[PDB]
Protein backbone atom coordinates (compact mmCIF):
# COMPACT_ATOMS: atom_id res chain seq x y z
CA UNK A 1 0.00 0.00 0.00
CA UNK A 2 2.71 2.47 -0.99
CA UNK A 3 3.60 4.58 -4.02
CA UNK A 4 7.37 4.85 -3.77
CA UNK A 5 10.13 7.47 -3.63
CA UNK A 6 8.72 10.02 -6.07
CA UNK A 7 11.23 10.27 -8.90
CA UNK A 8 14.58 8.49 -8.98
CA UNK A 9 17.33 11.11 -9.16
CA UNK A 10 19.39 13.34 -6.87
CA UNK A 11 19.32 17.15 -7.16
CA UNK A 12 22.31 19.23 -8.27
CA UNK A 13 21.45 22.64 -6.83
CA UNK A 14 18.89 24.09 -4.41
CA UNK A 15 17.81 27.66 -3.68
CA UNK A 16 15.06 29.07 -1.42
CA UNK A 17 12.42 31.12 -3.23
CA UNK A 18 11.94 34.71 -2.01
CA UNK A 19 8.59 35.52 -0.42
CA UNK A 20 7.36 31.95 -0.82
CA UNK A 21 8.41 29.00 1.38
CA UNK A 22 9.14 27.11 -1.83
CA UNK A 23 12.70 26.23 -2.85
CA UNK A 24 13.84 25.82 -6.45
CA UNK A 25 15.74 22.56 -6.89
CA UNK A 26 17.60 21.57 -10.05
CA UNK A 27 18.54 18.08 -11.24
CA UNK A 28 21.05 16.33 -13.47
CA UNK A 29 18.47 15.81 -16.21
CA UNK A 30 18.50 19.52 -17.09
CA UNK A 31 15.31 19.87 -15.05
CA UNK A 32 14.03 21.62 -11.92
CA UNK A 33 11.24 21.18 -9.37
CA UNK A 34 9.75 23.06 -6.42
CA UNK A 35 10.20 21.90 -2.82
CA UNK A 36 8.66 23.07 0.45
CA UNK A 37 10.71 22.44 3.63
CA UNK A 38 7.79 23.92 5.56
CA UNK A 39 5.05 21.58 4.34
CA UNK A 40 7.29 18.69 3.29
CA UNK A 41 5.71 19.08 -0.15
CA UNK A 42 7.60 18.14 -3.31
CA UNK A 43 6.01 18.48 -6.75
CA UNK A 44 7.34 18.13 -10.30
CA UNK A 45 5.61 21.21 -11.72
CA UNK A 46 5.14 24.84 -10.69
CA UNK A 47 2.31 24.98 -8.11
CA UNK A 48 -0.26 27.77 -7.96
CA UNK A 49 1.18 29.07 -4.68
CA UNK A 50 3.95 30.31 -6.98
CA UNK A 51 1.89 31.00 -10.10
CA UNK A 52 1.90 34.77 -10.51
CA UNK A 53 5.21 35.63 -8.87
CA UNK A 54 8.12 36.75 -11.06
CA UNK A 55 10.89 35.76 -8.65
CA UNK A 56 10.04 32.06 -8.93
CA UNK A 57 10.58 32.36 -12.68
CA UNK A 58 13.75 34.46 -12.60
CA UNK A 59 15.40 31.83 -10.40
CA UNK A 60 14.53 29.05 -12.84
CA UNK A 61 15.60 31.30 -15.71
CA UNK A 62 19.07 31.95 -14.32
CA UNK A 63 20.14 29.02 -12.09
CA UNK A 64 23.09 29.40 -9.68
CA UNK A 65 24.72 26.04 -10.41
CA UNK A 66 25.28 27.48 -13.89
CA UNK A 67 26.68 30.96 -13.26
CA UNK A 68 29.66 31.52 -10.96
CA UNK A 69 32.07 29.63 -13.19
CA UNK A 70 30.46 27.62 -16.01
CA UNK A 71 31.72 24.09 -16.68
CA UNK A 72 30.90 23.58 -20.35
CA UNK A 73 31.39 27.23 -21.27
- The third-level CATH topology is Ubiquitin Ligase Nedd4, Chain: W
Strand residues, percent: 15-25%
- Structural class label: mainly beta
Order of helices and strands: EEEEH
The total of beta strands comes to 4
The CATH class assignment is: Mainly Beta
Strand ordering within the main sheet:
1-2-3-4
Summed up, the helix count is: 1
**Based on CA inertia axes, which overall geometry fits?**
globular
Distance between the termini: 47 Å
Mind describing the biggest β-sheet?
A: 4 strands, antiparallel
CATH architecture: Single Sheet
What oligomeric state do these chains adopt? Answer: monomer
Helicity range of the residues?
A: under 10%
Return Rg in Å.
Answer: 13 Å
What is the domain total for the residues? Answer: 1
Fold and architecture overview:
- The protein is mainly β and 73 residues long.
- The protein has one domain (1-73): Ubiquitin Ligase Nedd4, Chain: W (Single Sheet), CATH 2.20.70.10.
- 10% of the residues lie in helices and 25% in strands.
- The protein contains 1 helix and 4 strands, in the order ββββα.
- It has a 4-stranded antiparallel sheet with strand order 1-2-3-4, with helices on one face.
- A hairpin with a 4-residue loop joins strand 3 and strand 4 (41-42).
- The chain is globular and about 45 Å long.
- The relative contact order is 0.21.
- This is Transcription elongation regulator 1.
Amino acid sequence: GSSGSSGKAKPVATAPIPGTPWCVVWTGDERVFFYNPTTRLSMWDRPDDLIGRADVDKIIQEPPHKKSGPSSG
